Design a protein around this ligand. Sequence first.
Ligand SMILES: NC1=N[C@@]2(c3cccc(-c4cncnc4)c3)CCOC[C@H]2O1
Length: 373
Amino acid sequence: FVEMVDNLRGKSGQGYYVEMTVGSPPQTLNILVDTGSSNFAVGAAPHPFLHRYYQRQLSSTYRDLRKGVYVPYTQGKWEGELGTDLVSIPHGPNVTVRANIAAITESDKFFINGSNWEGILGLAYAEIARPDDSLEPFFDSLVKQTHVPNLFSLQLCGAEVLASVGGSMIIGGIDHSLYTGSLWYTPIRREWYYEVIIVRVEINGQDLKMDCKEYNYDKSIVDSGTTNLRLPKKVFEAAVKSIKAASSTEKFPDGFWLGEQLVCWQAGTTPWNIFPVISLYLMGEVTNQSFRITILPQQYLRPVESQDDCYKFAISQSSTGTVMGAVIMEGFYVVFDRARKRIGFAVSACHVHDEFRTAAVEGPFVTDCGYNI
Ligand SMILES: NC1=N[C@@]2(c3cccc(-c4cncnc4)c3)CCOC[C@H]2O1
C-alpha cells in the first residue's frame, strides 16, 4: 500500500481531499473524501471558488444519463446533471472505474474559498444517495468492476493561511505501518451512513452518566466530511459544563465555547493540561462489550489563522445525532470494513500525545443504546 501513503491533503477545517482523474483524456481534480455522503459530484461549470472544473465535452468516454439531480444540505446546496465516465485515483489502486458522476452546474454555499477541492467523493452507502438508492456510489462501482477488496481505511493527520494537513486513504486494505497496538472494531449498525453506537462518554475519567440512548439520539455516525465532534443538545451541554470545570483555572469568552471565537496563547505556551481528555466508548462486536477512544485537547482545539497560537473549540451542538468528525478521526487509523460490516480504530502513527497524555484505543470494557428505529 506504499503508493497510497500520504495521498490526502487539506487545509485545517476545510476537509481532506485526494487527487482523482475523470474522463479521457484524464482531467485532474482534487476531491473531498466524505464518509458522510454517497454521491460522487464535481464542479462542472465556472464558480468564483473553483480553480478548475470537470469539462464533460472534453471527455471521449463521458456518457450522459439524461437525468437531473438536486441536492440541498442544511447549509448550502447544488444541482447537477448525471452521467458516467472513467475515474481513477492516481495515488490509489491501479484501476479505472466507470462511475456515476453528478456534474455540478449550479451551487450555493457548497464550494469553499481556498479549500483546494473541486468535488466530493461520497463513500457511504446507496441508501443515502441522491436522487435515490439506484444511483450506485463510487465505492460500490469500484468493488463490482475490479478485484479491490471491499474495505478502505483513513489515517487523517493533524497539522498567514490555514494550516496544511495530510493523511492517507488506503483503498482495498489495511496498512499496518499506519497504526500501533490493537485494532478494535465497532459494528456498522445499518448501511446508510457509517452508523455506530456509543455506549458511554467520559470527560477526564468522569462518566456523563446519561442513558446511552442520548449519545445516539437520533444516530451516531463516523464522518470524515465534518470537521467537528458534533453532539446532541443534552450531551453537548453536559460536555461543555465538564470541560469548563476542568479548565476553570482560566476563563474563556462564551463565543469560544460556542465554537465561533478563537482563544490564543503566546506561541508554545498553550496550557494543554487544563483541558480534559474525552473518552467515547463504542459498542464492541460482543454485545455487552465496548472499547474507548480517548481524544486529547490537541484534537478538539483546532488550530486556525504572528507569534500567537490560536484555536477554535471543535465540539459543537447537533440536532441530527452524534457526528464523529475529522478532529475525532485524527490520530486514529480508522478502518471502514464494509465486507464485515464494522469500523476499526487503532492509535495512529501520526496520533497526538504530549508528555503525560496520549490518544488511546483501549478495550474491552464490560457492562439498548440505539435510538433511531
Ligand atoms: N459529511 C458532510 N459532507 C457535506 C459537506 C458538503 C460541503 C463541504 C463539506 C465540508 C466542509 N468543511 C470541511 N469538511 C467538509 C461537507 C455534504 C453532505 O452532508 C453535509 C456535509 O457533511
